[PDB]
């Protein structure tokens, strides 16, 4: 997207979101990142929403095909699962490439740095979901390390009700439960996150209260499923 203006790429990403054209959205936001300027709060959300939708569809397809494949155990089901898996890995690698070149190194404010590091943890988590061979352990540790650095910053620099801090803790708890085989750590993190947010709600406006309690309900839903 080298010949399109940055502002036009951002405008078209918003249009693609309205049209539910998430592959286009992701390509426009990739082009915007590659302009080399830092991203605003809204622009970071557009980047994240675009790729979450793209990889979300790939993950859902991979799970369907992996399930069919396990029930069978010709080459077609494995071959097609492999094709989807490779395409998913390519999207995760693309996002991780954008974070590494050069979103994270230029992110100095807590809100941007925690956001990008949460993203890094998430896309390594998606790689871990399909990983088997020599690198599954290294991929898991890469997810854990990104999430941990984001946690450390968010606990130092953000209030316990901050939605980015809450969504980070939510996803790190899912990482513990689903990827790291640490359900007790998952439950403990979700509980402590919920309780510390509840005690901070009194400081918030009506709109901020709505933002934070929405994500706290997601923590509660997981705890209900896990206990």
């Amino acid at each position: 997207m080298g010949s399109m203006e940055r502002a036009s790429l951002i405008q078209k990403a918003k249009l693609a979101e309205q049209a539910e054209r998430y592959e286009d959205m992701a390509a426009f936001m990739k082009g915007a990142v590659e302009k080399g300027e830092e991203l605003s709060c809204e622009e970071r959300n557009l980047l994240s929403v675009a790729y979450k939708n793209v990889v979300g569809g790939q993950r859902a397809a991979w799970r369907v095909l992996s399930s069919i494949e396990q029930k069978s155990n010709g080459p077609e089901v494995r071959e097609y699962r492999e094709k989807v898996e490779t395409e998913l890995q390519g999207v995760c690698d693309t996002v991780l490439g954008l974070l590494d070149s050069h979103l994270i190194k230029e992110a100095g404010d807590a809100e941007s740095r925690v956001f990008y590091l949460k993203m890094k943890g998430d896309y390594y988590r998606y790689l871990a979901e399909v990983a088997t061979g020599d690198d599954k352990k290294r991929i898991i540790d890469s997810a854990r390390s990104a999430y941990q650095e984001a946690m450390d910053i968010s606990k130092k620099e953000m209030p316990p009700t901050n939605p980015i801090r809450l969504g980070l803790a939510l996803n790190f708890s899912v990482f513990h439960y689903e990827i790291a085989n640490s359900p007790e750590e998952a439950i403990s993190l979700a509980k402590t996150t919920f309780d510390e947010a509840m005690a901070d709600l009194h400081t918030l406006s009506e709109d901020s209260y709505k933002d934070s309690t929405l994500i706290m309900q997601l923590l509660r839903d997981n705890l209900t499923l896990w206990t």
Partner: peptide
């Protein structure tokens, strides 16, 4: 187990 949906801007 739900992660952040994160599908809507």
């Amino acid at each position: 187990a739900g992660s952040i949906p994160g599908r809507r801007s």
